[PDB]
């Protein structure tokens, strides 16, 4: 276990000659971040690199680039010895050559365009025999270091001349390229990629070791998600990482054949995959082969489904073969494929969130040159309901708008090809602002499962409510041992109630942010849709999504909707009966308590709710949320106005004193009304100052060139006289009465145990 | 129209419930604000309208 | 179904046995008098007694957690001794927890319902 | 340039709006090798003859790149799954789905299709 | 399920004797865990009886997958044992590895049963 | 009687009234 032996790990940094290590391994090996180290791999091939320090790097493993990884004939999980060299000196001449399949379309000189800023200021240590990659100019091109005069370990100095004379030569046949895809080309699904690595790597990388283990592997993995999430890409990336014999099976290619040809293709596929063990078989569009039994009319398609069921069960031979399959929804599959010894392990590849969308935009904007007007983070914040293929099409559309608008660049290249013209073109922010208007997304109908961003700072006050919520949610997650010691069952649900517009949704999102859990919101229209259409079997489909994303907070907004819509506990003669609430109670009684799924309801009419929900084992906590107090009103007025430029002359603490009895929605209303007044003043000043001043100008330009307004005192002073109270007094008295109907006790406050002798 | 045709907020026992107005509210909550689609309603009987339409965001 | 059997609210010995059966999982201090506890609760049901037992248990869990967080973190960041000198979980369920959780208890079944 | 093009464009409208006319006009303007595919002409053939006509059409369009392929009355070839009773019509739909995905070769072929 | 069968197979002189193999209870689940944990070496932290009491609605294949997942978590967490056998095989390394209680406490969170 | 006692309740929100203290 000597420390020079290192295991290959993926690096976060994208530099082509920089490796990374941890701090205590480097202190034990006695090295420094200024050192230029040398690596040794298989086939006597080396790579000289610059090492640095890291805290996120693990101790026994080294992080390196995929460029360094493919230039050693070394994959992940292997061993690399390292040798320090202070003998690394400067070079004499540098002779590299291009490679033909990457320069089929590009033309002209590549020296000053690519190679001159590449070796500038980085002090890159190169070696005779390495292949590096240069991105930029809407193309990535690779160069092999062919011949160097000095010793192979050398630092590129600016004094050292670089020779680029020679034909573009072909590669060695054992060399890899960018034709295949690695783990870097996939963003936004780190957890799922980690799970697939855990399932797949340890059996395939070590077949004899895992065979000596004797524990059976998984042999069927079912990827599923919305269309366009990149499931084929993930399968191909894992296949290229493990290096096993990957074979592709496409559904319509089988179903386009004749009767016997489909079975012959399936049998030849599994035979040729069992010859080249270890192997990965990928079956794309599984539902085109094996749909439900009611939908496969005819004999031949049921025969093909039975052939697949035969071969999956006959695969159990300990033959080191893993079968993956992708589909668009888990419901359309024939349920015989869900059994044990078959496709039983299921991985959910959902739609990506904002950090994921930012990573997708960073992946797709590597080669394209980019003007500094753009901010990809704001683009990722504005794209809502966008799968990664939508983002790739959006980058495509912005690039085509940028090439279209430069019709003088169409004139610049009528039929001649210049690399410098594509080098001379970048993409503005207004191209992306245009491309967001002609973008038709495909995931607005999907339920959003993500961690909220609302903190406790956006909510004013409610300190005992905050304490009781964190006691009910956070403590069984962090400290289960106390609940094992004292021996109680942790509670399962909470019902909020109160007047409208007082921050119940914000409290749910805040506790979901505090505990770092996923959040699933279900509004009133969805429950009413299930009630009108009588489709109450979708509730189990909701609770399954809640189980797949554990730990989670499941929030049912407006739980009194069907009871209000039915008769208001008055019409139709019935009392507190519902299809949908019945199915919710059944699913609450069904679920296990180990999964840490926490359910929250919220009403405005707590009298007309079904009393069978309030039993123990169900939503049994009742929390009253009143109108906000004065400090809470201060914090609400602060939290609403963080986006707006507010003048410092404005007194919010005086503003909270007048508004006795408002809700949160009234304060947001008056803030947005003051903002409307400011926008009207700015526009009607700008139109007059620009147009009405002079048509033919006296000066050369506008002498002012100054936007006048910000939000100031007279805007609030004017917008105050339109504000009104939303909640009357009798409504508040009703909530106080219902709060007193659940009163603590009478006469048990003075209970004491007797103290005698 | 449907609220007048149903009972005039009087018959059938129910209050302000509808299949079609429910689907309109769902489609209003669904859509993005970048598309510049602007919705206008018009009534003659504003008392019998569903109050869930008059919330903010609608 | 031809037999009709009426099941009333539990009597005093029944309330003693309910309070014993609910608390077998919990560590209860031996200072607690359950037989005095069944005398006050004239007219409760079983669910009320389980409610008040679980509420006392919640009070004990809150006291244990808010003691442990302060004793570990608030004491010293850089420790004077090598480890924690106490190394002792303080609470069990004792008299003041029931004494505090009593003033939240309520009767679930009114008089007219029993008369029916 | 390296940015991928669109490769499937779906014209749709009421009957008689002149979609065939627009496709033929764009084909005559660009001057590329225009090839016409008519739905009932395929569906009037025998079992293997339809697949042979589709494959020969896409091969002869990929020889004369750049080209435009126009498929008129797409719903006569590929309707919904519930409406395609029988095996051969689902087989033709799967043949079209195979060839559209296998078209991704950077072969400068654009496929347009019209429906009602 | 007995309902999906053609009812002509239920007649006399045919499949008439029926045996119902239901889901196992807690003693049964304990026996399944004892069967599947024969070969695997086992640390003394674990209590299989509490595991069998906590697994509710679990068929025996779920229990086999749970033992598989706990063993794979135990092999995964010892990345120093991954370093101990990079490509060499030692029987003593598998002899030197046991499974803690927190592996089973983790595997109960990522268990999706099929009999609720 | 508790309901009638709460119908003659003191106040809402006037508990924190204070005169301003400046200069
Ligand atoms: N998360 C992602 N990371 C990287 N590329 C992505 C991602 N999502 C989509 N893409 C790209 O968008 C396209 C999606 O291709 P596919 O792998 O076919 O997606 P898909 O989920 O397989 O769609 P289906 O179901 O097969 S039709 C490819 O060009 C991908 O490179
Ligand atoms: N906007 C138009 N401009 C010019 N000619 C038109 C227009 N609309 C219809 N026509 C004429 O009306 C006829 C329509 O022919 P088609 O191109 O077949 O229309 P269509 O929309 O393709 O009808 P289908 O869907 O194929 S049955 C032709 O004679 C066209 O010249
Ligand atoms: N503590 C608070 N801080 C800031 N804003 C609040 C607070 N409570 C409520 N609001 C305002 O109320 C609005 C949300 O209302 P919400 O509580 O979701 O209504 P409902 O309870 O009917 O769902 C937000 O726009 C927010 O500005
Ligand atoms: Mg696919
Ligand atoms: Mg036509």
Author numbering:
A (entry chain L): 21 to 777
B (entry chain K): 581 to 638
C (entry chain G): 639 to 754
D (entry chain K): 233 to 348
E (entry chain G): 349 to 464
F (entry chain F): 755 to 777
Give sentences copied directly from the paper behind this entry.
The conserved ATPase p97 (Cdc48 in yeast) and adaptors mediate diverse cellular processes through unfolding polyubiquitinated proteins and extracting them from macromolecular assemblies and membranes for disaggregation and degradation. p97/Cdc48 forms a ring-shaped homo-hexamer, with each protomer containing an N-terminal (N) domain, two tandem ATPase (D1 and D2) domains, and a C-terminal extension (CTE). The D1 and D2 domains form two stacked hexameric rings with a central pore. Both D1 and D2 domains can hydrolyze ATP, but only the ATPase activity of D2 domains is critical for substrate unfolding.
